Amino acid sequence: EESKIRAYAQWMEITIFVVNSNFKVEGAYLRWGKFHVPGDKDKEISPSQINGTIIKDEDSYTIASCGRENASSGTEGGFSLYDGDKLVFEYYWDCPWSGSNSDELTVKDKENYTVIKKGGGSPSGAMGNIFITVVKKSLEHHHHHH
């Protein structure tokens, strides 16, 4: 009952909201901690339950991970988002039990997508809530082919 309070003290929730296409989560993994149903750290889900998830246009989806009860140095992992067969971004976080939070968002097609993260990086204490927006550029607005 106090093993978990401790381990749960390092936690993140990442919400991906998308516009102008349907996108797919793939490549989710963890090296430390567990994934779980957002809002309920006692309900673990696997990478495989995340991978393949489609985020529909004008919807979001949240991934959540925290420390493992009586085990882990916090949470450390990542995932990738695709638009069909096109890799849009790779995300990675390392939020250790004892140490400084870090992350990294690698945008793979800046030309066709606007991808913006809020939260994340290197805050104190628990990693916390992180938000990524992804907008597939509309030619009539962005004129982004040339």
Residue numbers in the entry: 9 to 154
Give verbatim excerpts from the published study on this entry.
Here we report the discovery of a two-component WCR-active protein, AfIP-1A/1B, from the Gram-negative bacterium Alcaligenes faecalis. While the amino acid sequences of these proteins bear little similarity to known corn rootworm-active proteins, cross-resistance evaluations, competitive binding studies and comparison of protein structures indicate that AfIP-1A/1B kills WCR through a mechanism that is similar to Cry34Ab1/Cry35Ab1. AfIP-1A represents a 441 nucleotide gene that encodes the AfIP-1A protein of 146 amino acids with a deduced molecular mass of about 16.1 kDa and predicted pI of 4.8. Cell lysates of cultures of all transformations were inactive against WCR in diet assays when each protein was assayed alone but proved insecticidal when both proteins were present.
We were able to determine structure of AfIP-1A(I20M, T135M), an insecticidal variant of AfIP-1A, to 1.8 Å resolution by x-ray crystallography. In the P21 crystal form the structure of AfIP-1A is a dimer with monomers consisting of 11 beta strands with one short α-helix at the N-terminus. The N-terminal 8 residues in both monomers are missing from the model due to the lack of electron density in this region, indicative of a highly flexible N-terminal polypeptide. Three surface loops, residues 77–82, 103–109 and 128–131 are also highly mobile with weak or missing electron density. The monomer structures are virtually identical except for the above 3 surface loops and the flexible N-terminal polypeptide segment. Superposition of the two monomers on Cα atoms gave an RMSD of 0.0906 Å (calculated with LSQKAB28) over 118 residues. The superimposed structures reveal a high degree of structural similarity between Cry34Ab1 and AfIP-1A. The RMS deviation between main chain atoms of the β-sandwich (105 residues) is 1.92 Å. The major structural divergence is observed within the region spanning AfIP-1A Pro46-Ile62 and Cry34Ab1 Thr33-Asn37. Cry34Ab1 has a simple four amino acid coiled region connecting β3 and β4 whereas AfIP-1A contains a three residue turn, five residue β strand, and five residue α helix in the structurally equivalent region.
